[PDB]
């Protein structure tokens, strides 16, 4: 699932850090997994192929007709958004632990994509949410 793989990856990074005496850099397979994941997520969201629950063989067209004409119930859709929502904290923690370039654009792009796809509607007077992403964004804004 997620717990064992995430714990194994974190422990591998930690033992590599102990071995190299706390001196490492960023990796590339994380991006080689995220960018195809983002593209596949976008393609699945633009396809939206549904399937009737009891009508297991008749695949309903993306045009919504209310319900299945042969089964007056809900139609199971292909969201495919729970995987990226769980993969985002991995890249967030990685970019917080180690600083690298050429990927803050991808990070802000995927975060804004999630935000404007949902479009954080409640906020108190005392915010100040710590985020290395927002920190680097403000830094680049000031540098611009």
């Amino acid at each position: 699932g997620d717990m064992e793989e995430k714990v194994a990856r974190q422990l591998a990074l930690a033992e590599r850090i102990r071995a190299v005496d706390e001196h490492h850099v960023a990796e590339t397979i994380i991006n080689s997994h995220l960018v195809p994941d983002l593209r596949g997520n976008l393609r699945s969201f633009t396809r939206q192929e549904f399937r009737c629950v009891k009508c297991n063989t008749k695949y309903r067209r993306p045009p919504l007709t209310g319900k299945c004409p042969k089964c007056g119930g809900k139609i199971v859709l292909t969201v495919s958004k729970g995987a990226i929502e769980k993969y985002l904290p991995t890249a967030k923690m990685l970019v917080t632990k180690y600083r690298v370039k050429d990927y803050t654009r991808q990070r802000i792009c995927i975060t804004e994509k999630d935000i404007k796809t949902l479009f954080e509607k409640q906020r108190t007077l005392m915010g100040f949410s710590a985020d290395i992403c927002e920190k680097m964004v403000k830094e680049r804004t000031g540098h611009s």
């Binding site: 509607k121 409640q122 906020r123 108190t124 007077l125 005392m126 915010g127 949410s129």
Partner: protein
């Protein structure tokens, strides 16, 4: 660090800490010469829970020095599942990281647990003008929120001079409840001006279902300012939830 607190029957405290665990997991109980205190923030920085219990709640209370200890909410929820309403809860702690929970009765029970530490940052909430105060019963609010929970999540409270209204809007459902001084669910009103605010009711429903029916509640809010729901435990301790409303219509 060492202390001993004995009380014959603590089911209220048990369900209270159960609600606190359902709210958040990381929590630290600070033990001072006056009693116990706790303040739990929110991972999404939207809700704040506060509780204080002086030394006039339990039967036996002997503390050595004021400090801050930590208890895992999961490990505590795995403990309160055996709390009989006619038991004698004894919380004992020494200098080592050993916490003892004892129960005396038909069979002497004693559970030892490790004591981890919590490093949650504590900050005093700044003062804010309420401009709207009311004291109501818990059962009426609980049943109203349980009736308006299935239709929608944004429940709107409106308060005017000697007038209260709890409504639930939507596109295919509408609920309304009126409250006056001669009603059966209002204890007292301290309204100042016409206020109206809509709040989410997930944590609301959970925290009002965790609290019993005969208990009373005190709501403090304003036009669009965050709401604070407080109540008293055995006329000595205090407990208050605090959370901001939504900006949508």
């Amino acid at each position: 660090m060492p202390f001993e607190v004995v009380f014959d029957g603590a089911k209220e405290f048990a369900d209270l800490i159960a609600t606190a665990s359902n709210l958040i997991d990381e929590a630290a109980f600070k033990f001072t010469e006056e009693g116990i205190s706790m303040r739990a923030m929110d991972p999404s920085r939207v809700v704040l829970i506060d509780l204080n219990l002086p030394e006039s709640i339990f039967s036996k209370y002997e503390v050595e020095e004021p400090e801050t200890i930590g208890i895992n909410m999961d490990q505590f929820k795995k403990i309160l599942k055996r709390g009989k309403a006619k038991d004698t809860l004894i919380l004992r702690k020494g200098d080592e990281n050993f916490l003892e929970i004892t129960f005396e009765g038909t069979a002497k029970r004693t559970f030892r647990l490790p004591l981890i530490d919590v490093e949650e940052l504590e900050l005093e909430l700044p003062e804010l003008p309420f401009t709207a105060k009311v004291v109501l019963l818990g059962e009426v609010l609980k049943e109203g929120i349980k009736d308006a929970s299935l239709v929608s999540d944004a429940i709107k409270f409106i308060a005017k001079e000697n007038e209260f209204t709890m409504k639930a809007e939507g596109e295919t459902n509408e609920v309304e409840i009126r409250l006056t001084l001669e009603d059966e669910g209002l204890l007292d009103l301290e309204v100042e001006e016409e206020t109206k605010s809509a709040y989410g009711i997930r944590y609301l429903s959970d925290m009002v279902k965790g609290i019993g029916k005969a208990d009373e509640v005190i709501l403090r809010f304003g036009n669009e300012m965050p709401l604070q729901m407080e109540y008293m435990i055995r006329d000595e301790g205090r407990l208050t939830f605090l959370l901001a409303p939504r900006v949508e219509e």
